[PDB]
Amino acid sequence: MLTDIDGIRVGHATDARAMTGCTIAVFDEPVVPGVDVRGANAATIYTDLLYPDSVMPSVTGIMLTGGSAFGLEAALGAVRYFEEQGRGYDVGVAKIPLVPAAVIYDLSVGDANVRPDLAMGRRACEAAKPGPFERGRVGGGTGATVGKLYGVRQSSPGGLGTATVSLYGGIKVSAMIVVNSFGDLRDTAGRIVAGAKYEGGEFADTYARMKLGDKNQSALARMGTTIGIVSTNCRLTKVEASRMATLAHNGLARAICPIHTNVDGDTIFATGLQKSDLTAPVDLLGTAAAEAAMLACLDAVMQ
Amino acid sequence: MLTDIDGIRVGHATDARAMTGCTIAVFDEPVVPGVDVRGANAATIYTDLLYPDSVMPSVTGIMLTGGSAFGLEAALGAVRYFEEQGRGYDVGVAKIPLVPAAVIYDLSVGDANVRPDLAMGRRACEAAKPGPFERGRVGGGTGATVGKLYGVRQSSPGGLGTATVSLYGGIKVSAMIVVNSFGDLRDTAGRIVAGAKYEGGEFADTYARMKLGDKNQSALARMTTIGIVSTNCRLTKVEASRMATLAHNGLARAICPIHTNVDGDTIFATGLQKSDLTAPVDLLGTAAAEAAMLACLDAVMQ
Ligand code: NA
Ligand code: NA
Ligand code: NA
Ligand code: NA
């Protein structure tokens, strides 16, 4: 539950008919951001300010949205909304909010002509609230699918998941993940819980089929995705935030196979608190972020 | 003239009252893209697909826009226009165009509440045409200023510039640059031609003043030069990104200081996918640096 971290509110905007939507995490307390874009087919916005060699931005919120490249328009809708509310970096003649975002491809399910736009991004902001939020095929995970080796027709449903890992001294590391992965989802044992299926419904084991010569038949296979946020209540520097985001990808490799493929835009945002008394080594937080991300992946398909 | 390269069209959308705008370069011939974000304060979109470790995208156009972080909306206005025209990568159920973009901060001049949006992003695509295009305070350079050590009121006007460098065998390297730099602009002999000015006098020499202890008073100091370099040569993704990296050396020759904490300096680089012209990338990158430096001076000569 990402809202376990102080100052975080989560809001969904869902279109059940078109099978698309977006999800925003709003930070009522200033955060220290980081990012790691590992997929070879990612579409993001505002990520340059999330790197250690960039200045400290004023991140108002982070959004996970559907609609492929078109869906980033919902991020601008969040920016417009937050400026109206008086949030963002005070430049004197205006306030400049910042809403980094990453997308998943969900156009092959439902209505391909409906994507999150300025209005839908605003609706998610209006709905952002503390406490527990809904999981599953909601918000950014509404049109998510898992295991597309044989196309979306033989895939399993994806979704949005979340999980919290507790450490000592009140330290917490939480994750919220939208699973739209090309590969299969496995548990800690190794059994397939979601992925590419044969015509009758049995799981085909994507990786085993590719080793035998089965070719990628997904919509984006001609040119040559799992996105999420990991948050902790510890104080972090910019380097530590980006290192946390990098180590969190190890959790995706735990549950998803194959991962980081040429059709995946896998991206992990990471946040710490600017003002906080809790501190911990970055390798423990990064390992805890990997577990939280792995647990949130399974939560996305069991909810 | 960026349109010296095959298949490139350029369109401006200018609001002379609000002092903002945007410029798009449309690629009618398939291109190989690269990027180098060197500034510490950049706001961009769709740049991840421009790196060598990413798949080959279908770049429909590249935008240079004002409006600070808000102005990236104009890039999505261009995406909507291109999908209506039938351009973009075909997934069967739709076509997905791609318009990477970078912004400059121009809110402290003119109307701060007017920024490039979906509509003016679309208008810029409607104006795209081959041949020569206007330079100066037009399009993305409409509200550009140079030399903001003492704030925008003691600055010089910037703008949009362009230049073409010719090499052997019909090879061309062209650049189009929006100069909104924090530092001063100098010519090939070292004369200050644009930059921060004293309260009632000459150029202050920004670098010399900060060495003496003058503090940055720009609006973003509590926490830009963007452009495109293009060649008619065939390039791989690595060579395109290497061309963008070397092009920044031309920016360093013209502007000082450069790549500061208030600059979002970004260079896009393109080569042709189908072309029989080839050349060493380090030579093309050096010509790209020269073209970028000449384009900086062109922006203030108009
Ligand atoms: Na959909
Ligand atoms: Na995807
Ligand atoms: Na302006
Ligand atoms: Na700027």
mmCIF file of N, CA and C in Angstrom, chain B residues 174-249:
data_model
loop_
_atom_site.group_PDB
_atom_site.id
_atom_site.type_symbol
_atom_site.label_atom_id
_atom_site.label_comp_id
_atom_site.label_asym_id
_atom_site.label_seq_id
_atom_site.Cartn_x
_atom_site.Cartn_y
_atom_site.Cartn_z
ATOM 1 N N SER B 174 23.702 20.387 -41.067
ATOM 2 C CA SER B 174 22.944 21.596 -40.790
ATOM 3 C C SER B 174 22.458 21.592 -39.347
ATOM 4 N N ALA B 175 22.201 22.790 -38.828
ATOM 5 C CA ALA B 175 21.772 22.959 -37.450
ATOM 6 C C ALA B 175 20.689 24.024 -37.372
ATOM 7 N N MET B 176 19.811 23.876 -36.383
ATOM 8 C CA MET B 176 18.822 24.893 -36.051
ATOM 9 C C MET B 176 18.741 24.968 -34.536
ATOM 10 N N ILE B 177 19.009 26.149 -33.985
ATOM 11 C CA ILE B 177 19.268 26.319 -32.560
ATOM 12 C C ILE B 177 18.383 27.431 -32.012
ATOM 13 N N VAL B 178 17.820 27.204 -30.827
ATOM 14 C CA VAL B 178 17.112 28.233 -30.072
ATOM 15 C C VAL B 178 18.017 28.673 -28.930
ATOM 16 N N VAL B 179 18.430 29.936 -28.948
ATOM 17 C CA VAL B 179 19.412 30.448 -28.000
ATOM 18 C C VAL B 179 18.665 31.223 -26.918
ATOM 19 N N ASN B 180 18.577 30.627 -25.728
ATOM 20 C CA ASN B 180 17.982 31.229 -24.540
ATOM 21 C C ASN B 180 18.960 31.131 -23.373
ATOM 22 N N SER B 181 20.252 31.256 -23.669
ATOM 23 C CA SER B 181 21.297 30.853 -22.741
ATOM 24 C C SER B 181 21.379 31.780 -21.534
ATOM 25 N N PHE B 182 21.765 31.197 -20.396
ATOM 26 C CA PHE B 182 22.060 32.004 -19.218
ATOM 27 C C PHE B 182 23.321 32.834 -19.425
ATOM 28 N N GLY B 183 24.324 32.270 -20.102
ATOM 29 C CA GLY B 183 25.587 32.944 -20.302
ATOM 30 C C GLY B 183 25.583 33.865 -21.509
ATOM 31 N N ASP B 184 26.741 34.471 -21.751
ATOM 32 C CA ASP B 184 26.903 35.422 -22.840
ATOM 33 C C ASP B 184 27.296 34.710 -24.127
ATOM 34 N N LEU B 185 26.949 35.334 -25.247
ATOM 35 C CA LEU B 185 27.294 34.840 -26.574
ATOM 36 C C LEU B 185 28.467 35.646 -27.116
ATOM 37 N N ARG B 186 29.457 34.953 -27.674
ATOM 38 C CA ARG B 186 30.630 35.583 -28.259
ATOM 39 C C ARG B 186 30.801 35.129 -29.702
ATOM 40 N N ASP B 187 31.446 35.972 -30.507
ATOM 41 C CA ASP B 187 31.727 35.622 -31.892
ATOM 42 C C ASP B 187 33.067 34.890 -31.973
ATOM 43 N N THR B 188 33.543 34.647 -33.198
ATOM 44 C CA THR B 188 34.733 33.826 -33.398
ATOM 45 C C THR B 188 36.007 34.488 -32.888
ATOM 46 N N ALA B 189 35.993 35.798 -32.653
ATOM 47 C CA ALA B 189 37.162 36.501 -32.144
ATOM 48 C C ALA B 189 37.079 36.796 -30.653
ATOM 49 N N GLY B 190 35.967 36.466 -30.006
ATOM 50 C CA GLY B 190 35.827 36.660 -28.580
ATOM 51 C C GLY B 190 35.101 37.914 -28.151
ATOM 52 N N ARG B 191 34.534 38.678 -29.083
ATOM 53 C CA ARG B 191 33.748 39.841 -28.700
ATOM 54 C C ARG B 191 32.391 39.403 -28.163
ATOM 55 N N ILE B 192 31.961 40.031 -27.072
ATOM 56 C CA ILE B 192 30.617 39.793 -26.560
ATOM 57 C C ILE B 192 29.619 40.480 -27.483
ATOM 58 N N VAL B 193 28.715 39.698 -28.070
ATOM 59 C CA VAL B 193 27.673 40.244 -28.928
ATOM 60 C C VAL B 193 26.303 40.238 -28.260
ATOM 61 N N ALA B 194 26.091 39.415 -27.237
ATOM 62 C CA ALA B 194 24.837 39.395 -26.502
ATOM 63 C C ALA B 194 25.098 38.793 -25.132
ATOM 64 N N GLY B 195 24.467 39.358 -24.109
ATOM 65 C CA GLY B 195 24.648 38.853 -22.764
ATOM 66 C C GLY B 195 24.110 39.831 -21.738
ATOM 67 N N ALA B 196 24.413 39.531 -20.476
ATOM 68 C CA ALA B 196 23.986 40.389 -19.380
ATOM 69 C C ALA B 196 24.654 41.754 -19.479
ATOM 70 N N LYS B 197 23.889 42.795 -19.163
ATOM 71 C CA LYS B 197 24.355 44.171 -19.226
ATOM 72 C C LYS B 197 24.260 44.819 -17.852
ATOM 73 N N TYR B 198 25.094 45.832 -17.634
ATOM 74 C CA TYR B 198 25.073 46.569 -16.382
ATOM 75 C C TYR B 198 23.788 47.391 -16.271
ATOM 76 N N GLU B 199 23.576 47.962 -15.081
ATOM 77 C CA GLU B 199 22.346 48.706 -14.817
ATOM 78 C C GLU B 199 22.149 49.834 -15.822
ATOM 79 N N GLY B 200 23.233 50.494 -16.213
ATOM 80 C CA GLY B 200 23.162 51.534 -17.219
ATOM 81 C C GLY B 200 24.437 51.634 -18.027
ATOM 82 N N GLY B 201 24.775 50.572 -18.753
ATOM 83 C CA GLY B 201 25.996 50.586 -19.530
ATOM 84 C C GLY B 201 26.251 49.368 -20.394
ATOM 85 N N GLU B 202 27.505 48.924 -20.413
ATOM 86 C CA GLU B 202 27.980 47.943 -21.373
ATOM 87 C C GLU B 202 27.705 46.518 -20.893
ATOM 88 N N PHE B 203 28.175 45.548 -21.674
ATOM 89 C CA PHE B 203 28.108 44.157 -21.259
ATOM 90 C C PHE B 203 28.940 43.947 -20.001
ATOM 91 N N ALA B 204 28.399 43.162 -19.070
ATOM 92 C CA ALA B 204 29.049 42.987 -17.779
ATOM 93 C C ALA B 204 30.089 41.876 -17.779
ATOM 94 N N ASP B 205 30.103 41.025 -18.809
ATOM 95 C CA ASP B 205 30.895 39.797 -18.826
ATOM 96 C C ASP B 205 30.447 38.891 -17.687
ATOM 97 N N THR B 206 29.491 38.003 -17.977
ATOM 98 C CA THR B 206 28.873 37.183 -16.936
ATOM 99 C C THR B 206 29.914 36.369 -16.176
ATOM 100 N N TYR B 207 30.804 35.689 -16.901
ATOM 101 C CA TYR B 207 31.782 34.821 -16.251
ATOM 102 C C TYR B 207 32.704 35.615 -15.334
ATOM 103 N N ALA B 208 33.206 36.757 -15.810
ATOM 104 C CA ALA B 208 34.076 37.580 -14.978
ATOM 105 C C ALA B 208 33.353 38.085 -13.736
ATOM 106 N N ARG B 209 32.056 38.382 -13.850
ATOM 107 C CA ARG B 209 31.310 38.873 -12.695
ATOM 108 C C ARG B 209 31.120 37.782 -11.648
ATOM 109 N N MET B 210 30.780 36.561 -12.073
ATOM 110 C CA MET B 210 30.621 35.482 -11.101
ATOM 111 C C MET B 210 31.946 35.099 -10.456
ATOM 112 N N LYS B 211 33.062 35.279 -11.166
ATOM 113 C CA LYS B 211 34.365 35.086 -10.536
ATOM 114 C C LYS B 211 34.598 36.096 -9.422
ATOM 115 N N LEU B 212 34.066 37.311 -9.573
ATOM 116 C CA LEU B 212 34.187 38.338 -8.546
ATOM 117 C C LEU B 212 33.196 38.156 -7.405
ATOM 118 N N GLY B 213 32.208 37.276 -7.555
ATOM 119 C CA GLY B 213 31.273 36.976 -6.490
ATOM 120 C C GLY B 213 29.837 37.374 -6.752
ATOM 121 N N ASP B 214 29.521 37.903 -7.935
ATOM 122 C CA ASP B 214 28.141 38.245 -8.256
ATOM 123 C C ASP B 214 27.276 36.989 -8.260
ATOM 124 N N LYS B 215 26.127 37.066 -7.597
ATOM 125 C CA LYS B 215 25.254 35.915 -7.429
ATOM 126 C C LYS B 215 24.199 35.857 -8.527
ATOM 127 N N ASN B 216 23.845 34.632 -8.912
ATOM 128 C CA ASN B 216 22.849 34.406 -9.951
ATOM 129 C C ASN B 216 21.478 34.871 -9.471
ATOM 130 N N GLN B 217 20.861 35.776 -10.229
ATOM 131 C CA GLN B 217 19.559 36.334 -9.889
ATOM 132 C C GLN B 217 18.460 35.881 -10.842
ATOM 133 N N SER B 218 18.726 34.880 -11.679
ATOM 134 C CA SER B 218 17.718 34.397 -12.609
ATOM 135 C C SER B 218 16.579 33.711 -11.857
ATOM 136 N N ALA B 219 15.439 33.583 -12.543
ATOM 137 C CA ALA B 219 14.226 33.102 -11.890
ATOM 138 C C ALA B 219 14.356 31.656 -11.427
ATOM 139 N N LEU B 220 15.202 30.863 -12.083
ATOM 140 C CA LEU B 220 15.385 29.462 -11.732
ATOM 141 C C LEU B 220 16.620 29.223 -10.872
ATOM 142 N N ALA B 221 17.219 30.282 -10.324
ATOM 143 C CA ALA B 221 18.477 30.136 -9.597
ATOM 144 C C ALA B 221 18.312 29.433 -8.256
ATOM 145 N N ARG B 222 17.092 29.369 -7.716
ATOM 146 C CA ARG B 222 16.897 28.774 -6.398
ATOM 147 C C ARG B 222 17.056 27.258 -6.407
ATOM 148 N N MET B 223 16.960 26.618 -7.568
ATOM 149 C CA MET B 223 17.075 25.166 -7.647
ATOM 150 C C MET B 223 18.536 24.721 -7.617
ATOM 151 N N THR B 224 19.168 28.205 -21.223
ATOM 152 C CA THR B 224 18.950 26.978 -21.986
ATOM 153 C C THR B 224 19.217 27.203 -23.471
ATOM 154 N N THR B 225 19.908 26.259 -24.101
ATOM 155 C CA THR B 225 20.145 26.283 -25.541
ATOM 156 C C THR B 225 19.800 24.906 -26.096
ATOM 157 N N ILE B 226 18.758 24.837 -26.922
ATOM 158 C CA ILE B 226 18.297 23.579 -27.497
ATOM 159 C C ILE B 226 18.331 23.685 -29.014
ATOM 160 N N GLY B 227 18.516 22.547 -29.674
ATOM 161 C CA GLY B 227 18.577 22.585 -31.123
ATOM 162 C C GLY B 227 18.660 21.207 -31.740
ATOM 163 N N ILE B 228 18.625 21.201 -33.072
ATOM 164 C CA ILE B 228 18.704 19.993 -33.884
ATOM 165 C C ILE B 228 19.893 20.120 -34.825
ATOM 166 N N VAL B 229 20.669 19.046 -34.946
ATOM 167 C CA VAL B 229 21.721 18.939 -35.950
ATOM 168 C C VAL B 229 21.382 17.761 -36.853
ATOM 169 N N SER B 230 21.445 17.978 -38.166
ATOM 170 C CA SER B 230 21.034 16.962 -39.125
ATOM 171 C C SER B 230 22.053 16.862 -40.250
ATOM 172 N N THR B 231 22.185 15.655 -40.797
ATOM 173 C CA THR B 231 23.076 15.393 -41.917
ATOM 174 C C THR B 231 22.363 14.506 -42.928
ATOM 175 N N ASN B 232 22.788 14.600 -44.185
ATOM 176 C CA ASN B 232 22.264 13.729 -45.228
ATOM 177 C C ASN B 232 23.006 12.401 -45.304
ATOM 178 N N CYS B 233 23.969 12.171 -44.414
ATOM 179 C CA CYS B 233 24.683 10.907 -44.357
ATOM 180 C C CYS B 233 23.835 9.840 -43.673
ATOM 181 N N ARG B 234 24.145 8.583 -43.982
ATOM 182 C CA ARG B 234 23.547 7.458 -43.279
ATOM 183 C C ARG B 234 24.283 7.235 -41.963
ATOM 184 N N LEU B 235 23.527 7.062 -40.882
ATOM 185 C CA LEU B 235 24.098 6.875 -39.557
ATOM 186 C C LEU B 235 23.394 5.735 -38.836
ATOM 187 N N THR B 236 24.147 5.036 -37.990
ATOM 188 C CA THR B 236 23.546 4.140 -37.017
ATOM 189 C C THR B 236 23.109 4.937 -35.789
ATOM 190 N N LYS B 237 22.418 4.258 -34.868
ATOM 191 C CA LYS B 237 21.949 4.935 -33.662
ATOM 192 C C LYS B 237 23.113 5.431 -32.813
ATOM 193 N N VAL B 238 24.200 4.657 -32.747
ATOM 194 C CA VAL B 238 25.369 5.073 -31.974
ATOM 195 C C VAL B 238 25.969 6.342 -32.558
ATOM 196 N N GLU B 239 26.143 6.370 -33.881
ATOM 197 C CA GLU B 239 26.766 7.525 -34.517
ATOM 198 C C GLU B 239 25.898 8.770 -34.376
ATOM 199 N N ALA B 240 24.575 8.605 -34.419
ATOM 200 C CA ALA B 240 23.687 9.745 -34.218
ATOM 201 C C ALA B 240 23.847 10.323 -32.818
ATOM 202 N N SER B 241 23.910 9.458 -31.803
ATOM 203 C CA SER B 241 24.100 9.937 -30.438
ATOM 204 C C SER B 241 25.492 10.528 -30.251
ATOM 205 N N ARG B 242 26.496 9.962 -30.924
ATOM 206 C CA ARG B 242 27.838 10.529 -30.862
ATOM 207 C C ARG B 242 27.891 11.895 -31.536
ATOM 208 N N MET B 243 27.140 12.074 -32.627
ATOM 209 C CA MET B 243 27.077 13.383 -33.271
ATOM 210 C C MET B 243 26.474 14.427 -32.340
ATOM 211 N N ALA B 244 25.423 14.056 -31.605
ATOM 212 C CA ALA B 244 24.802 14.994 -30.677
ATOM 213 C C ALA B 244 25.765 15.385 -29.565
ATOM 214 N N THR B 245 26.564 14.429 -29.085
ATOM 215 C CA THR B 245 27.504 14.718 -28.009
ATOM 216 C C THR B 245 28.595 15.675 -28.471
ATOM 217 N N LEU B 246 29.132 15.457 -29.672
ATOM 218 C CA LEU B 246 30.172 16.340 -30.187
ATOM 219 C C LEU B 246 29.623 17.718 -30.535
ATOM 220 N N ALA B 247 28.338 17.802 -30.898
ATOM 221 C CA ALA B 247 27.743 19.091 -31.241
ATOM 222 C C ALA B 247 27.773 20.061 -30.065
ATOM 223 N N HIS B 248 27.751 19.547 -28.832
ATOM 224 C CA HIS B 248 27.804 20.418 -27.665
ATOM 225 C C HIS B 248 29.111 21.194 -27.583
ATOM 226 N N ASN B 249 30.185 20.683 -28.192
ATOM 227 C CA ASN B 249 31.442 21.425 -28.212
ATOM 228 C C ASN B 249 31.298 22.743 -28.960
#
